[PDB]
Design an enzyme around this catalytic site. Structure first.
Site, PDB file in Angstrom:
ATOM      1  N   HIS A 154       0.816  -1.213   0.000  1.00  0.00           N
ATOM      2  CA  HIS A 154       0.000   0.000   0.000  1.00  0.00           C
ATOM      3  C   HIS A 154       0.850   1.264   0.000  1.00  0.00           C
ATOM      4  CE1 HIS A 154      -3.896  -2.001   1.226  1.00  0.00           C
ATOM      5  NE2 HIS A 154      -3.025  -2.927   1.586  1.00  0.00           N
ATOM      6  N   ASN A 191     -10.273  -2.267   3.803  1.00  0.00           N
ATOM      7  CA  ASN A 191     -10.069  -2.326   2.358  1.00  0.00           C
ATOM      8  C   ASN A 191     -11.402  -2.067   1.695  1.00  0.00           C
ATOM      9  OD1 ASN A 191      -7.355  -2.835   1.962  1.00  0.00           O
ATOM     10  ND2 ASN A 191      -7.577  -5.068   2.051  1.00  0.00           N
TER      11      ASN A 191
END
Ligand code: HEM
Ligand SMILES: [C-]#N
Ligand SMILES: [C-]#N
Ligand SMILES: [C-]#N
Ligand SMILES: [C-]#N
Lengths: 497, 497, 497, 497
Positions: free
Chosen positions: D71, D144
């Site tokens: 990420h 998420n």
């Protein structure tokens, strides 16, 4: 008992009649029980979901940072610097702008060779660094309790330090290393003679002098410059420990220096120093019998009298040692307008060394650490990011100079003093510069018969453990200083052997 | 003189006529003069183009790394472990596979609370970590010179260590911290008693025993397991130092342990320890009077006889202390098949703390450092990169598992032994377990009148600097072990006050 | 498919017969099951005992190291340098001593502004760093695909790079930042012009030239010195990508350059460059119409013909990218005897910057990393310790210079060339040095009409997003280079607006 | 233009009336000229005296920190959380105490596989981390844009991430690695189906949902507990990007997501999300058809209806990206009283990894970083020191627990919820839990023919580049989901091949 001992008691009393704060994790989550870990069954294994444990243990596992490569053992205090005299004729530095002006200071005293758990009362130089939080940024006068040093070129420093520390294989102090280096580099004779004299072991930090050692440069409003030496004499008077008392204390209280300082301040006995400066014009430096920038030489008071400037006062103890003392960082390159460096090779090297070692020891943003922050100035530039950026990182201000968007601008008045130097750009050997003259004067005049006796004994007492060929070389150098010096030491060596 | 003192001499001799190597920079460029810097003119400023200088200085500035959070002061040596008896019915671990088998080992002895520059001869438990480089990876037996410890829950370790170290504000040893904790946590009585006995200050590292302390688990070839204790008795016999002698040496030779060990080995007097194990069947664990996993308890030899296993022999001194000793890392979690953890809460916590602190102290790839490398094994996995990745990083081998490209595969024979556990997953209080019984047996029978007297004056000598309320709380605990224990200490305290 | 895609297949095939290695933990302990974590019961919580899990996860958590501050996205390869001509009359460097002499080299190509996950085919200069592993240590010729640069003083470099990167608040590329800096700093005119021409986007790394850019100094055995320029022309011929194609590829394959290079070498198409040098005597350095050390100037081939020296050949792909490419480090300061730096302020700043940034990005002992090791030289000095000390740390060799024990000695022959510089020591402004003459020649004499058209279109296409006032200053600067240059851009700016 | 572009112009305007700040060094010393370095003469080398240069350059050299291992590419924003409904019957967490209660929040959106300079508009799941600064400390909901994940056991995570990234040798995206892993671990089918659907490339961060994904545990005021799922639906509505448009944008604007968020907030269009929860009792946990703690499973809305709880609103942009976004840290283990973990193996692993990776990426004291500090809580504990200790380090407060000096106490009401377990502490296999049922419901009931068509085209489009043997295995799994799923994909693969 003493204030140091009652540290916790006093902390407790200041909480008076009030319930203790809630015990939490690093993230501020309240802890229900920090005395037992989570296990499946009273005698089952430990679970990873015991975050309270990991959080605390992990931090505990990260408490240590590298100690200072040198001067690792030390103590700190806080106070102020007050201007008592007008020297603006020499320096335009805001710190001296007007008599009566007070500037906050931070100080750290220390030995040199011993690591963090070593004794205070041992023969060794003493660090006496002072951080001035001026309006023109921080000014670090990183000095020692001696006006001179063992070497005159920075490229020998790493080696000198190595010779002074532990053997790479055995990890034991090694007199062969100490004396092989010193006997091979006779320029150390001056400082070595000072080290093995009575002042080698001060009775604590309050009873010793402080010195910038190096020749610095001062610049006045008119752009005129002069050279100077910084001096801060003890108002508590010079006082030293005997070899016997120092050894006893190194055993009884390895933290004698820390205790002494803390308790003095704690009881209101704030130690102070009288700040002075020696001035030498450029014309004089040209006529000086030695290199005025040679760290192994001193400026005779007869020819360069001490000019009073102010007082140095320590009146506040640290509240948290690690945060305020262990993490403090002094950079000789931290000089505000009015104070500049001289061409002393040793200082020149230190200009680079300190900021460098700090980025490693503390971190890239070590100046963000509270005690290192130049809080009496507004830091505005184009430096950004880096690990552990603990400030606004200068918000969204344009990060490039020049720019047409109102970002910080350079201040011309702050421009450095320019000199024209001559000669080729190369390595000039200074090994053969005068290494005995001033030492002779020290041995004969600065010391008396009684002091010359202890000096020789202290030296012989340590040198006796170096190999014979090293003792001979060392003595050869001493003899060069004065026959009585070398012969007295040899006589003692003779009996040890 | 002794071998240690002659380190450099021998190194020199070991290079007969052999010419000296060329002094080069870190990048291997030859240096023409590493004795003077580059300046503009004989008395001009330093130049940036003198990379010889900054190359050497920059490295000097980064020589230090964080010392161990605990056990910072120590000595190291190498040798081997040899199997003398057959314990394959208990453990299938390759290190014990057959009588006569030798496995290379690395050892490091240390004190506990003192930092890097502290004295060796001080009252403190002694670290005795052993690293076995087996074919099934490294087996780190991180033991101490005592079979027990001060606490029984890992979540109290950080607090305990804090209480053993410096006061947060003064940076001084604080007896109020030491005794407030111990008095508040009476489970410490057992090890405190051992600490303040003659065994507290060993005469060097060669005259003390070693223990895994914790209860571990052994698994044989059939999948059957038993709990055990590791013991390594000194073949040089137990020998201690008197408080006076220890105090004297702490000043005369702060590195007494390092020296003694180095010299013993350098003169051919290789120290050895006889390796034993105690065995307790899962069934016996059911009946044992206390928690067999309680680190404050021992397994009485009367009921659990020492089973001889082999020998630990130290026949090699380190060549570079920093690389081989300062950088060495032991992880209790490093256990090969046949040796596993037990539910001892303290051991469980150590399974995390060690490699965690190591990733901080040494770095992410600390297992790459030569001395920490499991060289007698083939490291093959899916771990990659990380700072200072000194290796081929396992080349172009597929880095994910599972995979269809021949990368490393898990081996079913390496599967761990399973134990059934049941109950609630929560924090179970163990502060109230038995804290006096085993302690009393030590005071009454293991020690005689002469030793008990010293034990008490040793405790009282330190405890006397603690506040009265703490003294009383401490004495109450001692009185509970035995009226004579408390009353003798109180009697000594009374005259001290 | 292509060799790059079949990486895993070929690896799998190279082990044809062979049984897969045992999957182990970092310490070498065999793993039974690395596909399931340890829980208490099928649906129970995770236990700390699962060291297999922790060991691997902890390493994954530490895989990343800071990317390069500039030139982050790149590709590497290995090969050799072969001497084809004799230039010993100019340099005594061993790397050039004999025609036909081969020296192993490491190379890394790269863009400048983009971070690690950016595309290769973008307008940006290209890095072309060459590491020569010589007997006199490593020689790093850290070049670009251009002979010049945007600025001529290093103190502006950080700002320049800032202006080229992301906005401090929005994290977006900022054309106002880009063009404000460039318009405010017209020294950039020369390189900006190169940047926005056809060579702004090379068709891979094999179709671009390489330049040392800076002026360097060469010393022959007689101690005579001359200044020089290093050039390495592509033997594959210069081939660029159209703005349209580069854009499409930046989307289709952001790793175009890496892939291209790998496959070229993988299929036997070993790229090579012809190595040359331009020479200017100290005598000629006086008469040169420009400052021979100004990085915004080139030496006209007419007056300083390219002199052939050798070949640069890349015939080996990296086996592990992280270990050999990401971790590689080039320091312009890595110069062996015979090759020295010139007074180019830019080069001088880089002398410090590279090793400095490497100690941060990689670590204090980055030179220990295999790919950075000067493995064709014996590193012998007095530098010791530091984080991740992976070599024997030079064993027990005496660690101080000078010494009487035979440790490494300096070799006088390697002393640097000394020059006499005159002038005051101060900050000399260089913002007004001829910023157009050479730029005009390039526009008028080097490029043809269709090339000038594209240059303008490319400039305008990007400049059109900057504020009008910035566009004006920018156009004013270009107009000063050549009236038709500025007007053409302004015309394009007009319609885009 | 847009607010993002006018960032600097706006900054300048805010400083309307005001002299620009004085440009200083890090130490706060005014700079006279930061545009030219100090040299000896107009054409002489650089001096070490120029600390202005070194100071700035050295900090530039240290600007970079390691990017998040996963990420790495993202965007941040700030706002608040407002409670709309009363769910105190399920949780006692202060963040939910009463309707209308607002808690400040910090959010960071991101992709997964790509590095820092990668494009936003690419197929990859999206990170949606939410930090709530509650009174009971920080609560990190690291979610998420999907309710599920690719795997169900944390030990496969490093490998999964490795297969999703670059080949270890070529440093290129490798579809063989991607699909070899997925095809061998069919439990990924559920999330792979989501990823390759239309929601694989959402139109910016404002047009996607967020989920805690895992099953968590909620505890109320009287110790009753229930399990839950966190859901936060976009009030801006679901909006995705076509493959063609995503590819174009990845070239036209790699920072598309960042720009969209900033301008949206800058122009007052504050994006919000409606926060809900699903509740499952311990009894329903028994009846659930699958393992309720299996990350590859969802709780059918029909059986477990969404229960409205509040709103998430982002109304503030970062002022300094590096400071507030790049350095932000979310730890799933940061859960205040009332919210706890569940036995979900994946979550249990995350409990460790995050704080762990943060100590590496940011630093041991990362929680001290402003954006990470639990500023609405009083952090009081027994943790001390560590690198970059940027606070008072808790002053002189007693550093050990328990103590008799009034330091922080544990709070019994903050104890976790205890559950009973029974079973062997071993590695249980979950590789064979249902991997297709819910996936089928998705393919059949949730999607229509257009979407299934797009889904298959997307998979085949990427899967076609893998080796046939991998293709076949992948198709076999899809066939196990539904015959049509595998045939449609196989049909396309036939064409592509
Ligand atoms: C005074 C201005 C300059 C400074 C301060 C500077 C600084 C840096 C820094 C700090 C890096 C990252 C190094 C690393 O982490 O490995 C870098 C990389 C690089 N610089 Fe410079 N640079 C400057 C000028 C230039 C110029 C003029 C050139 C070419 C002649 C150049 C070529 C390169 C190359 C090729 C790299 C990438 C090396 C690699 O592939 O690892 N730089 N520069
Ligand atoms: C500095 N010593
Ligand atoms: C462990 N001490
Ligand atoms: C270099 N840039
Ligand atoms: C998680 N990534």
């Amino acid at each position: 008992r003493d204030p140091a001992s009652d540290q916790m008691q006093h902390w407790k009393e200041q909480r008076a009649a009030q319930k203790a704060d809630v015990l939490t994790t690093g993230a501020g989550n309240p802890v229900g029980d920090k005395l037992n870990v989570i296990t499946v069954g009273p005698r089952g294994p430990l679970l990873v979901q015991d975050v309270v444990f990991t959080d605390e243990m992990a931090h505990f596992d990260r408490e240590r940072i590298p100690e200072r490569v040198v001067h690792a053992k030390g103590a700190g205090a806080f106070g102020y610097f007050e201007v008592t005299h007008d020297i603006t004729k020499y320096s335009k530095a805001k710190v001296f702008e007007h008599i009566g002006k007070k500037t906050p200071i931070a100080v750290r005293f220390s030995t040199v060779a011993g690591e963090s758990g070593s004794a205070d009362t041992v023969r060794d130089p003493r660090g006496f660094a002072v951080k001035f939080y001026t309006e023109d940024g921080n000014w670090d006068l990183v000095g020692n309790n001696t006006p001179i040093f063992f070497i005159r070129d920075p490229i020998l420093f790493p080696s000198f330090i190595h010779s002074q520390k532990r053997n790479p294989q055995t990890h034991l102090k090694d007199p062969d290393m100490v004396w092989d280096f010193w006997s091979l580099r006779p320029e150390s004779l001056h400082q070595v003679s000072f080290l093995f004299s009575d002042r080698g072991i001060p009775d604590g930090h309050r009873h010793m002098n402080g010195y910038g050692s190096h020749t610095f440069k001062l610049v006045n409003a008119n752009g005129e410059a002069v050279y100077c030496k910084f001096h801060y004499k003890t108002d508590q008077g010079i006082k030293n420990l005997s070899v016997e008392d120092a050894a006893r204390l190194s055993q009884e209280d390895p933290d004698y220096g820390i205790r002494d300082l803390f308790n003095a301040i704690a009881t209101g006995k704030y130690p102070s120093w009288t700040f002075y400066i020696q001035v030498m014009t450029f014309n004089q430096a040209e006529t000086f019998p030695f290199n005025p920038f040679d760290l192994t030489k001193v400026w005779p008071h007869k020819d360069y009298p001490l000019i009073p400037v102010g007082k140095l006062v320590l009146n506040r103890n640290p509240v948290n040692y690690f945060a305020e003392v262990e993490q403090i960082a002094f950079d000789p390159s931290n000089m505000p307008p009015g104070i500049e460096a001289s061409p002393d090779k040793m200082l020149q090297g230190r200009l680079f060394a300190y900021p460098d070692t700090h980025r490693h020891r503390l971190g890239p943003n070590y100046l963000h650490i509270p005690v290192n922050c130049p809080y009496r100035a507004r830091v505005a530039n184009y430096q950004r990011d880096g690990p552990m950026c603990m400030q606004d990182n200068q918000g969204g201000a344009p990060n490039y100079y020049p720019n047409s968007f109102g970002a910080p601008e350079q201040q011309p008045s702050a421009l450095e003093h320019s000199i024209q130097y001559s000669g080729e750009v190369r390595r000039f050997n200074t090994a053969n510069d005068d290494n005995v003259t001033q030492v002779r004067a020290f041995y004969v005049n600065v010391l008396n018969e009684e002091q010359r006796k202890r000096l020789c004994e202290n030296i012989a007492g340590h040198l006796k453990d170096a190999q014979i060929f090293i003792q001979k070389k060392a003595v050869k150098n001493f003899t060069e200083v004065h026959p009585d010096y070398g012969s007295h030491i040899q006589a003692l060596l003779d009996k040890y052997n």
